[PDB]
């Protein structure tokens, strides 16, 4: 796994607490056991033998799998939650506004004037953005998906349009 040992323990901790919260339900009850669980992690926090620490983690994962709630609580908009992707059918891409009939664009003379400025800004910045990536990407291509910030003033961060202009989470 790409995750370091330190990252693995933390993800288990958060996962373990959430499933514990599903079992307890009542907040006072959950608080009591959450502190006991934090104690178990705090007990071996300073273990320095990475063969013992790795063993402690693997055993902990096995215990979680035996004790996990079969139906854990999920935030409504998280993957698997009851509202996940509920609004994707209302998210329309912004390029659809180019196909609007003139009479449709005439009802928003001020929105479509601002829209042109952004399109101009996108057109003017693109060439610099492409150049910045070329002269920063090591020979052979990128090694990670991390993108650079803008360096000069008046430069926009490379590859920004589809991040800045993405639909709102409540588009309608």
């Amino acid at each position: 796994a790409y995750l370091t040992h330190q990252q693995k323990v933390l993800r288990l901790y958060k996962r373990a607490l959430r499933h514990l919260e599903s079992w307890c339900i009542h907040r006072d009850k959950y608080r009591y056991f959450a502190c006991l669980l934090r104690a178990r992690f705090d007990e071996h926090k300073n273990e320095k033998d990475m063969v013992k620490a790795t063993q402690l983690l693997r055993e902990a994962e096995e215990e979680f799998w035996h004790g996990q709630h079969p139906q854990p609580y999920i935030f409504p908009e998280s993957p698997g939650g009851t509202s996940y992707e509920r609004y994707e059918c209302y998210k329309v891409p912004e390029w659809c506004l180019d196909d609007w009939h003139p009479s449709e664009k005439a009802m928003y003379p001020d929105y479509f004037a601002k829209r042109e400025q952004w399109k101009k800004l996108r057109r003017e910045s693109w060439e610099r953005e492409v150049k910045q990536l070329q002269e920063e990407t090591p020979v052979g291509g990128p090694r990670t998906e991390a993108l650079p910030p803008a360096r000069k003033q008046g430069d926009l961060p490379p590859l920004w349009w589809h991040i800045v202009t993405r639909p709102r989470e409540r588009p309608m």
Binding site: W65, R143, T144, L159, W161
Partner: protein
């Protein structure tokens, strides 16, 4: 704790997999190599997806290979086997029914739609 037992339709969890642990310099060098390929392809896609003047489709060679490989092998449950099985079921059924009709032992009192 009873160990997890994995089926075809119920895969093994990552957290229960011994491979995921015991990091080796080779496995990390394999993981680092896959990420490089993914980042190379992501950059290739992003430089066309974010292009201001591109109106169309970003042809994916991976999707072209997939459909091409799937549509090629044009030519059990696919031979004489199923046909012969069903031939005897209907022939056997219709032979019995014909005999009963001839022997007047099949009730068709109100059967006049066929």
């Amino acid at each position: 704790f009873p160990k997890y037992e994995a089926s075809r339709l119920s895969s093994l969890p990552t957290t229960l997999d011994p491979a995921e642990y015991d990091i080796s310099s080779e496995t990390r060098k394999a993981q680092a190599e896959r990420l490089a390929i993914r980042s190379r392809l992501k950059r290739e896609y992003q430089l066309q997806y974010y292009d201001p003047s591109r109106r169309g489709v970003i042809e994916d060679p991976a999707l072209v290979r997939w459909t091409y490989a799937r549509s090629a092998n044009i030519y059990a449950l696919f031979g004489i086997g199923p046909l012969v099985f069903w031939y005897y079921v209907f022939k056997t059924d219709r032979d019995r029914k014909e005999k009963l009709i001839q022997e007047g032992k099949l009730d068709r009192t109100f059967n006049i739609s066929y």
